[PDB]
């Protein structure tokens, strides 16, 4: 029977973003061949079941630096990391094939199903 | 623009609550007179007006322990601090006054105005 306030998952989340722009908090470094981003664990984990299988073992919970597959495309990467933060996708004719193999890596259902309704309405 | 997912931001806030049930990468304890509880830091900033005010500043950023002060009431800090993490507060008659006092002190202005409009409503 909660107040329910509908404003503030998507404050929180823009919170995080901001606070990932300052570089306040982050503890990972994701290594995409020549590019490298900082990121919060809790965010990836809350968002990429490959981040989740990661960081949930107590093996490889305090690793500071994740290096991602060698055919990954660090832009595909970038644009994946920002729709973490923002619940925003920049999916185009252009990168749907590097976004959604990246997707499909990072083992983001919602966006391999919303990468798999942009392919069928092309 | 970007594709917009309108469940994202509740979905990444869900995780994160679940993984603060699992103790999962929390950074700090918050003491509140004769009870602790555990959090992410980065989701006490996000929520809170006091808790960004202490971790902005690189002097308190690493700090693992935060005392609340003694007056705090810890019942009313754990109704903020589920408040924080589900989108959803446990307002109530019996509760009002000492939910309000601890928002004012947490700097919650969405959940002062709130609790300023439960009392404008009965
Ligand atoms: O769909 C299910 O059956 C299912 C239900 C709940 C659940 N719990 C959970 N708790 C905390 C986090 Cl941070 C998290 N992240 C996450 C995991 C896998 C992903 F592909 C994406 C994100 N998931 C995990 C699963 Cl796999
Ligand atoms: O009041 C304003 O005009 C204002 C506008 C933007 C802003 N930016 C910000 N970026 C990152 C985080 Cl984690 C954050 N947290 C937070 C700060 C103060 C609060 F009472 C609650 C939450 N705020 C801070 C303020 Cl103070
Ligand atoms: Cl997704
Ligand atoms: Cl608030």
Same mark, same amino acid.
């Not at 968002?47 to 989740?52: D, E, P, T």
């Given at each position: 029977?909660?107040?329910?306030?509908?404003? $503030?998952?998507?404050?929180?989340?823009?919170?995080?973003?901001?606070?990932?722009?300052?570089?306040?908090?982050?503890?990972?470094?994701?290594?995409?061949?020549?590019?490298?981003?900082?990121? $919060?664990?809790?965010?990836?984990?809350?968002?990429?079941?490959?981040?989740?299988?990661?960081?949930?073992?107590?093996?490889?919970?305090?690793?500071?630096?994740?290096?991602?597959?060698?055919?990954?495309?660090?832009?595909?990467?970038?644009?994946?990391?920002?729709?973490?933060?923002?619940?925003?996708?920049?999916?185009?004719?252009?990168?749907?094939?590097?976004?959604?193999?990246?997707?499909?890596?990072?083992?983001?259902?919602?966006?391999?199903?919303?990468?798999?309704?942009?392919?069928?309405?092309?």
């Amino acid at each position: 029977s909660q107040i329910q306030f509908t404003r $503030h998952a998507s404050d929180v989340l823009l919170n995080l973003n901001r606070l990932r722009s300052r570089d306040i908090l982050t503890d990972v470094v994701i290594v995409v061949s020549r590019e490298q981003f900082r990121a $919060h664990k809790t965010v990836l984990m809350a968002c990429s079941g490959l981040f989740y299988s990661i960081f949930t073992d107590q093996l490889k919970r305090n690793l500071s630096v994740i290096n991602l597959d060698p055919e990954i495309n660090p832009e595909g990467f970038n644009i994946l990391l920002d729709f973490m933060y923002t619940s925003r996708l920049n999916l185009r004719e252009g990168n749907i094939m590097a976004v959604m193999a990246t997707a499909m890596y990072l083992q983001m259902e919602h966006v391999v199903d919303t990468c798999r309704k942009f392919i069928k309405a092309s």
